[PDB]
Write a protein that binds this ligand. Structure first.
Ligand SMILES: [O-][n+]1cccc(C[C@@H](c2ccc(OC(F)F)c(OC3CC3)c2)c2ncc(C(O)(C(F)(F)F)C(F)(F)F)s2)c1
Ligand SMILES: [O-][n+]1cccc(C[C@@H](c2ccc(OC(F)F)c(OC3CC3)c2)c2ncc(C(O)(C(F)(F)F)C(F)(F)F)s2)c1
Ligand SMILES: [O-][n+]1cccc(C[C@@H](c2ccc(OC(F)F)c(OC3CC3)c2)c2ncc(C(O)(C(F)(F)F)C(F)(F)F)s2)c1
Ligand SMILES: [O-][n+]1cccc(C[C@@H](c2ccc(OC(F)F)c(OC3CC3)c2)c2ncc(C(O)(C(F)(F)F)C(F)(F)F)s2)c1
Ligand SMILES: [Mg+2]
Ligand SMILES: [Mg+2]
Ligand SMILES: [Mg+2]
Ligand SMILES: [Mg+2]
Ligand SMILES: [Zn+2]
Ligand SMILES: [Zn+2]
Ligand SMILES: [Zn+2]
Ligand SMILES: [Zn+2]
Lengths: 334, 327, 334, 327
C-alpha cells in the first residue's frame, strides 16, 4: 500500500532520491538509509512500476513486495559488501544499461524481466567468503555443488526457492513457456557472474564488437539466443563490476566495503591456519594499488569493450572510470 | 597480548556464576564461544579423555561460532557462550559431584554450544507462517531446534572438524542420542512437561551414600541434563542485574525487529514484538513469575542448596523490574 | 487412455471394480493391476469425486491427476509392502471408516480432506527399511530428522514438497486459513502413524471411549481440536493397521508382502554384520506366530477400542479380525 | 558350493571385454557392483595401497549399490558394475601402460562406480520440465550428473563407509577433483566437445620412449580419463552381441516407461520414448553411427591398435541390428 513498497515518513526525501533511478550514480546508500534498509525492495518496486512490469506480467503488487522483502531479507546485513545494497545497486545499474540508446527496442519484456530479476538475486545469501574458502573447508555448499560455481549456483537456487514462500510467487501468472524461458535466461545470467567465466565472456564480447551489426534503426542486431543472452550476461556482469565507473564518492564507499569483507575473510583464514587469500591480509595490503590493478586488468578492459558495443552511449561512464583510476593512483603511498 | 592478560584474568571466573561474558566477547575479538569452550575443555581435561586433537577442537569451535549470526541481537554466539558456561557451572554443582560420566558431561556441554546455531532471529511460528523451507522440511515441528541439531552435527564434517573422531562407536551412539535429547528439550513447547518431571523427581529424590544425587536409569539422568541445559538457556534473570539488563535489551531488540518484519508484511505481530505497544518491564516480571522462577525454584530444590544464591538473585531481580513497571 | 470418448475394455472392468470403493474388502490388488499400477491415483480420484472434494475446494481436475500420479510415482515399486498399493489401501480404508454411521456429519470437509490426504502420503518414498535401520547406518535421513520419527517426518516433507512440481498444487485455491489448518491436521495425523506413538494413542482412545458422549442422534460428540484430531489420528492409524481385519484372501497377500520386506531388511542387516531386527530373519522366522502376536498385542486391542467408540458399526470388522486370528492360530505348526 | 564356484568362475573374466555381468548379477544375488568392484580392487591391490579396511569397502559398496534403483531397467547397479568393469579393462590397455598413478586409477574406477547412483530412470529434461526439487537445486544444469556425485560422496559418511579414511588431505583433494571432473563429463551435453578435444589429442599424439602415451599436464591426463569412462559408459554396442542386446532391451524399456509417464502427464514424448511409434533396430544403428562409432573410432586412434577388436565387434553388431530393420 505504501508509495514505495515500504513505510517511511521521510517519504518526501526518499521520493526525491528515487527520481534518479534512471541515472548512473543514484545515491543508493542514501536510499538505503531513507528506506529503513530496504534499498532492494524500493528500487526494484520503482523499476517494475517504471517499466510497467506488474501489468505486463500480471504481478499482484502485494506479491511483488512480499517477495522483494523476502529476497532482501536473505541478503546478510553483517556482510559489508555482498549485501542488499550491492544487490540494489546492481539492479539499478542493469536498469540503466538496459535503457541505453544502442539497445532500444532490442530486448523483449521477458528478457528485461530476466536481466533485472537475475540482478536482484545474483548474490542472495552470500556469506561474505569466496568459493575457494567454501571449498577448502569442505562446506556442505561445495559438496552439494561439486566445487563448481558454488556460490553462484546457490544464489540462483535461493532466489528461485523464495518464490515458494507465502504469497511470493511473482511469476504465478506467466505461461509455462514464459517461465521456462525466463528461468533459463536468469540461470545463464547469474552463472556468468562467476569471475572464473570473466575472460571467456570478455573474449566473446570483443568478438561480437568486431563483427558488430546494427539494424535499420540505430540499434544492435542480435539474431540468435546465443548472441542475445551473451549481451545480457555481459550487461549484468558489467553492472556487477560497475563500482569504479560511478561517482568517486560512491566508488570509495564500495572499495571500503569490499576491503572490509576481504580482510574479514583474511582474519578467518589466519585463525584456521589457512593460506590467506589475495588482498585479504590487513597486515599486508595495498588498497589503492589494488584498485588501480583491478581497473587496469579487469574493469577497464570490460567497460572499454562494452563502450564499443554501445558506442558512444557509455563514453561518460568510461571517462569517469579513468578519472577514478587516477585518483586511486594518486593516493598510493610512495 | 596486553589484553590477553585481561581476557585470561576474566576467564578465571569461568567457574563462577556471573562471568563477564560480554567483556570476554570483546577481549577475544568476538570469539566468546570458542575461547570459553576451549577453557572448559582444558579445565575438564576433555581433550585427553576423548583424545580430541587441539587443532581439531578449535577449528570446530570457530566453525560452530561462525554459524551463529552476528546480526542477531540475542540468539548469537554470545548467548551460546553464556549457556555453555552456565551449563559448565551447573555441572560442577556439589549435589552432582562425580554423578555424570565424562561422556554425559561432554554431551551437556556440546549440546549447549550448538543449541541455537544458525538461529535467524525469528520464531518458529514466523518460519511456519511464511512457508519457509525450514518449516517445510521439519513439518512445523520444533523447526529451529531440529535445525540447530542438524547444523551442529553437520559442521563436524567440515575440514578437520571431527572432534569425536576418536570416540568409539558406542560412545558416538550414546553421545549423539544425549545431545539430540538435550537440544530438543530447549524447545519452549516442552517446558511444562519437562518441569513436571523435574518436580516429580525432586519429590522422590534419592541420595547416594556420598550425599550426591542418585541417578539410576537413562530416563532420569537425561531428564536432569535436559533441565540443566534448559535452566542454563533460561538463566538470564538469575545473573547479576547488570548482565540481566543487557540480555533483556538484546531479546527485546530481536523481538521488535521480528515485529517490524511482521508489520511490513501485513502479518499479525507476535506477542511482545510490537515496539509501538510494548511492556518490556511487565513482560520480564511475567517471564520470571510464570517461567523462570518456577523452573529455578525446582532446580534449587534438586541441588539444594548450592543454587540458593542463584535463586535469591533471581527474586531480587524480579522486584527491580517490578518497580520499573509504568504506572 | 480411452478411445472415441468411450471406455476401453480394461477401463470398464476397472470402473466396475471401483464400484466397491465404499466397501471394506475392496479388491485393491486387482485394481492395481487393472489401472496399470495406478491404484493410488484411481482410488484417490474416485474418492475425491465421490465426496465432491474438487468443487468444495476448487481443485482443478488436471492438477489433481497430475499431483496424484506424481505422488504415486514417489512410492517405490520395488518395495514389497510400503508401496503405492499400501497407500491406496489406507486411503480407501480411511474413506470407509470416515463414513461409519457413528461419525455421520461429525467431521468437516476440510477434516475429511486432511484424513484422506494424510492417508495418501503417509508412507511416500518409503525405502523398505525401518527407522532403526536408517538410524543404525547413520543415513542422511536420520541425520536430518535427529533419529526421531525419521521416516514419518520424511513422508510428510515429501508429500507436501511434491505440491511444488509443475501443475501439482491441489490446494492452490484454499485460503491461508484453510491451508494452515489442513497442514497442521495432516502433520498431526501422519506423525501419529509412527508405531512409537501407538500405546499413548490407544490410551487416549480408550479414555475417550470411557468419557464418550453422544447426542439426540447416535452420533459422537467431539468438542475441541484435541479430541477431533485424536479420533482422526486413530482412524488413519486403524486404517494403516487394517490388513488383519480384511477378508483372509487380502490379509494373506499383505502378510506375504510385509514378510518379504522384513526378510529383505534382514538380509541387508546380515550382509552388513548388523543384528537382525525382530522377525526379519528368514532362517529363524515364525510367520504364523508373529501374525497371531501382532493381532493379540496390537491390532485387536486397537480395533476392539475403536469398535467401542463407534459401536456397533465395526462389529463385522472385529468379527473378521477374530476369525483371521483363529485361522493363523490353527496354522501354527507344533 | 556350486553357485559360489560358478560365480568365482565367472569373475575370472573380470579383466576381459565381454564379461558375463548379467550372469554375475544373478549369481551374486543382485550384488554385481559389490562383487565386481571388490574383485577389481583386489586385482589392482587397491585395498593395500590405500589402506582401505575390507569391511569398510564391502559396507560402502553394498550401500552404493543399494542406492541404485532396482526398479530402473537400464540405469541400475548392473550398468554401474558394467561401466566399472569396462573402465577397469580400458585402464589395462597397452598404450596406457605405466601412465596413470594409483590415485588416478582409483579415481577413474570410483567415478565409474558412482556415476549413475540414485538415477530415477528419467532424463534431466523430464526432471527440469516437472520442476523437480532436484532440478531446482542444480539450476537445470547437469542435474542428474551433479546429483550422482553428491550421493556417491555423501554415502562415504554412513556407518563404516569412508573407504578413503586413510588417504591424506592431499590425496583426498586430488581424488575428489578428478572424480568430479570425470562424472560431470558423462553428461551427454558434453559429448561433442569431449570428442573434439579427444580428436585434437589424437592429432597431436605424443608417444613416449616406451611407445606408451605421453601426458604432461593434468588437463591432458583428465581428458583421457574422462573420455575413457565416457567410452565405458557408451560401450554396450561394442560388447558381444548377447550382452549388447540385453542392454538395448533395457534402455528401450526405460525410455518407453519415461514415454508412458510423459504421455499420461500430457507432456511431449521424448525422442525414442514412444512405444507406439518406435524403431528400436533403426535407433540402435543411428546411435552407433552418430555417437558410439565416432567416439570409439577416435579412441582406437588414441590407443592404436589396442582397441581394434573392440572396434570390429562394434561394426559387426551394427550390421546385425541393421539387417534386423524390417521393410
Ligand atoms: O566473486 N566475485 C564475483 C563478482 C564480483 C566480485 C567483487 C569484485 C570487486 C568489486 C569491487 C571492488 O572494489 C571496488 F570497486 F568496490 C573490488 O576490489 C578488488 C579487486 C581488488 C572487487 C571482484 N572482481 C574480481 C575479483 C577477484 O578477487 C580478482 F582477483 F579478480 F580481483 C577474483 F574473484 F576474480 F579473483 S573481486 C567478486
Ligand atoms: O523459543 N525460545 C526458546 C528458548 C529461549 C527463548 C528466549 C526466552 C527469553 C530469554 C530472555 C528473556 O529476557 C531476558 F531474560 F533476557 C526473555 O524475555 C521475555 C519473555 C519476555 C525471553 C524465552 N522463553 C520463552 C519465550 C516465549 O516467547 C514466552 F512466551 F514464554 F515468553 C515462548 F517462546 F515461550 F513463547 S521467549 C526462546
Ligand atoms: O513402522 N511401521 C509403522 C506402521 C506400520 C508398520 C507395519 C505393521 C505391519 C503391517 C502388516 C503386518 O502383517 C499383515 F497384516 F500384513 C505386520 O506383520 C507383523 C507384526 C508382525 C506388521 C507393523 N506394526 C507394528 C510393527 C512392529 O514391527 C511390531 F513390532 F509391532 F511388530 C513395530 F514397528 F511396532 F515394532 S510392524 C510399520
Ligand atoms: O543421458 N544419458 C547419459 C549417458 C548415457 C545414456 C544412455 C545412452 C544409451 C546407452 C545404450 C543404448 O542402447 C544400447 F546400447 F544399450 C542407447 O540406445 C539409444 C540411443 C537410442 C543409449 C545414450 N547416449 C546418448 C543418448 C541420447 O538420448 C541420444 F539422443 F544421443 F540418443 C542423448 F542423451 F544424447 F540425447 S542415450 C543416457
Ligand atoms: Mg556473485
Ligand atoms: Mg533455541
Ligand atoms: Mg509409515
Ligand atoms: Mg549418467
Ligand atoms: Zn555481485
Ligand atoms: Zn538458547
Ligand atoms: Zn503405512
Ligand atoms: Zn551411465
Amino acid at each position: 500500500i505504501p508509495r514505495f513498497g515500504v513505510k517511511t515518513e521521510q517519504e518526501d526525501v526518499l521520493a526525491k532520491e528515487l527520481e534518479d533511478v534512471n541515472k548512473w550514480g543514484l545515491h543508493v546508500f542514501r536510499i538505503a538509509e531513507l528506506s529503513g534498509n530496504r534499498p532492494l525492495t524500493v528500487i526494484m518496486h520503482t523499476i517494475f512500476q517504471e517499466r510497467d512490469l506488474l501489468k505486463t506480467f500480471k504481478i499482484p503488487v502485494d506479491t511483488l513486495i512480499t517477495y522483494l522483502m523476502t529476497l532482501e531479507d536473505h541478503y546478510h546485513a553483517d556482510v559489508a559488501y555482498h549485501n542488499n545494497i550491492h544487490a540494489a545497486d546492481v539492479v539499478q545499474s542493469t536498469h540503466v544499461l538496459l535503457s541505453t540508446p544502442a539497445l532500444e527496442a532490442v530486448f523483449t519484456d521477458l528478457e528485461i524481466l530476466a536481466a533485472i530479476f537475475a540482478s536482484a538475486i545474483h548474490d542472495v545469501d552470500h556469506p561474505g567468503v569466496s568459493n575457494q574458502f567454501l571449498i577448502n573447508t569442505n562446506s556442505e555448499l561445495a559438496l552439494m555443488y561439486n566445487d563448481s560455481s558454488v556460490l553462484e549456483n546457490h544464489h540462483l537456487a535461493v532466489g528461485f526457492k523464495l518464490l515458494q514462500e507465502e504469497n511470493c510467487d511473482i511469476f504465478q501468472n506467466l505461461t509455462k513457456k514464459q517461465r521456462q524461458s525466463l528461468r533459463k535466461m536468469v540461470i545463464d545470467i547469474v552463472l556468468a557472474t562467476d569471475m572464473s567465466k570473466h575472460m571467456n565472456l570478455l573474449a566473446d564480447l570483443k568478438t561480437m564488437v568486431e563483427t558488430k551489426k546494427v539494424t535499420s534503426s540505430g540499434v544492435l542486431l542480435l539474431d540468435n539466443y546465443s548472441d542475445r543472452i551473451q549481451v545480457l550476461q555481459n550487461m549484468v556482469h558489467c553492472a556487477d563490476l560497475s563500482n569504479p565507473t560511478k561517482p568517486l564518492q560512491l566508488y570509495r564507499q564500495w572499495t571500503d566495503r569490499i576491503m572490509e569483507e576481504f580482510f574479514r575473510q583474511g582474519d578467518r583464514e589466519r585463525e584456521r591456519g589457512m593460506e590467506i587469500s589475495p588482498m585479504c591480509d590487513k597486515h599486508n595490503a595495498s588498497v589503492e594499488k589494488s584498485q588501480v590493478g583491478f581497473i587496469d586488468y579487469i574493469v577497464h578492459p570490460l567497460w572499454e569493450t562494452w563502450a564499443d558495443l554501445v558506442h558512444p552511449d557509455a563514453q561518460d561512464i568510461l571517462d569517469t572510470l579513468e578519472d577514478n583510476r587516477e585518483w586511486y593512483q594518486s593516493t598510493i603511498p610512495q
